[PDB]
């Protein structure tokens, strides 16, 4: 549960910057802007309340470029293999 | 992308890390997994060069925590976000 | 890649963040910058749709800090690494 | 300055896993394996000393996919524009 205050925001393009009530670190948010049941609200303004739920990224893949660079970061929903012996 | 099949370059199933060559594209993938993606059962490593399959999803909803020094202090899934109405 | 020219979608030069459409490829880019990449001089925003240039480098040498809960707790540049000899 | 101990390592492929002497978080390292002046040392083993220098990633670009996903993370060496007015 993350509660905080808008520093700046671009809801239409799905990103923003928030100061959480807890900890000492601000957060840049990116999200799919769209619909999930309620009518659209105004792009929030500096000082407005914002809430979200966050979860650790414990299951992921990092794609590595031919040059060794960071070429993507995905969620790993599942993985399977046949164990040796 | 959804389904990702490939072959194992290296694996450490005890610690939940692996390195895979996908059958598609030119980029290898490091994986970090828990029981969430791999299941509860204790499973030993696959052999290098054997098959491995997964399911992947783009991370579209995320937070980057920014440190006092301005660095990347954390990367999280943003499960839901809401704000006050104007 | 080196040189990256593009056009501004949105910008916040006061806080060191921006969003750019590169002239090359199909992917937009969010940038986070300090005086290290942007210079000391106070500069106001460019206009939306104007040109912007940068220089980029792949991050090949890095550390991912893993939290007690197994998450991504930090991402850093690894400037040098060494280990004991066998 | 980061000092720590090898948990596992693959020097030839340029990655590893370290427990730093400081803090409560382990670190997965990726690096370009190659030459920078000295002769090659053995892949380190569990319990071996490892050292490195780390720096915050303060100047970066994140590439966003057509689907909104994380499609790359680069270092931003510089950036320039003509300020409006």
Swiss-Prot record, chains A, D:
Expression induction: Represses its own translation via the N-terminus (at protein level).
Knockout-associated phenotype: Essential, it cannot be deleted. Upon depletion cell growth and total protein synthesis become linear.
Localization in the cell: Cytoplasm
Post-translational modifications: Phosphorylated; probably on a serine. (Microbial infection) ADP-ribosylated and RNAylated (about 30% of the modifications) by phage T4 ADP-ribosyltransferase ModB. This results in covalent RNA-S1 conjugates and allows the phage to reprogram the host's gene-expression system.
Superkingdom of origin: Bacteria
The record's note on its domains: The 6 S1 motif domains are not equivalent; the first 2 no longer bind rRNA but instead are involved in protein-ribosome and protein-protein interactions. Binds to the 30S ribosomal subunit via its N-terminal fragment (190 residues, the first 2 S1 motifs) and allows translation by S1-free ribosomes. The same fragment represses its own translation. The first 3 S1 motifs do however bind to mRNA pseudoknots in the 5'-UTR of at least 1 mRNA (rpsO); deletion of S1 motifs 1-3 but not motifs 4-6 is not viable, although a deletion of motifs 4-6 grows slowly and is cold-sensitive.
Complexes and interactors: Part of the 30S ribosomal subunit; the largest protein subunit, it is loosely associated and not always found in ribosomal crystal structures. Does not bind rRNA. Probably requires ribosomal protein uS2 to associate with the 30S subunit. Binds in the junction of the head, platform and main body of the 30S subunit; the N-terminus penetrates the 30S subunit while the C-terminus faces ribosomal protein uS2. Nascent polypeptide chains cross-link this protein in situ. Can be cross-linked to mRNA in the ribosome.
Family to which the UniProt record says this protein belongs: Belongs to the bacterial ribosomal protein bS1 family.
Free-text function comment from the UniProt entry: Required for translation of most natural mRNAs except for leaderless mRNA. Binds mRNA upstream of the Shine-Dalgarno (SD) sequence and helps it bind to the 30S ribosomal subunit; acts as an RNA chaperone to unfold structured mRNA on the ribosome but is not essential for mRNAs with strong SDs and little 5'-UTR structure, thus it may help fine-tune which mRNAs that are translated. Unwinds dsRNA by binding to transiently formed ssRNA regions; binds about 10 nucleotides. Has a preference for polypyrimidine tracts. Negatively autoregulates its own translation.
Protein's name according to its UniProt entry: Small ribosomal subunit protein bS1
Portion of the full sequence shown: 364 to 398 of 557
From Swiss-Prot, chains B, C:
Induction details: In response to low temperature (at protein level).
UniProt GO molecular function: DNA binding; nucleic acid binding; RNA binding; single-stranded DNA binding; single-stranded RNA binding; transcription antitermination factor activity, RNA binding
Record carries keyword Ribosomal protein: no
Sorted UniProt keywords: Activator, Cytoplasm, DNA-binding, Stress response, Transcription, Transcription regulation
DNA-binding listed as a keyword: yes
GO biological process: negative regulation of termination of DNA-templated transcription; positive regulation of DNA-templated transcription; regulation of gene expression; response to cold
Coiled coil: none
Location in or out of the cell: Cytoplasm
GO cellular component, one term: cytosol
Source domain of life: Bacteria
Function (record text): Binds to and stimulates the transcription of the CCAAT-containing, cold-shock-inducible promoters of the H-NS and GyrA proteins. Also binds to the inverted repeat 5'-ATTGG-3'.
Protein name in UniProt: Cold shock protein CspA
């Amino acid at each position: 549960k993350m509660t905080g205050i808008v520093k700046w925001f671009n809801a239409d393009k799905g990103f923003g910057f928030i100061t959480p009530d807890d900890g000492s670190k601000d957060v840049f948010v990116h999200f799919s802007a769209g619909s999930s049941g309620a009518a659209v609200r105004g792009n929030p303004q500096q000082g407005d309340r914002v809430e979200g739920k966050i979860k650790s990224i414990t299951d992921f893949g990092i794609f590595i470029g031919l040059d060794g660079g960071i070429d993507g970061l995905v969620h790993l929903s599942d993985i399977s293999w046949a164990q040796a012996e």
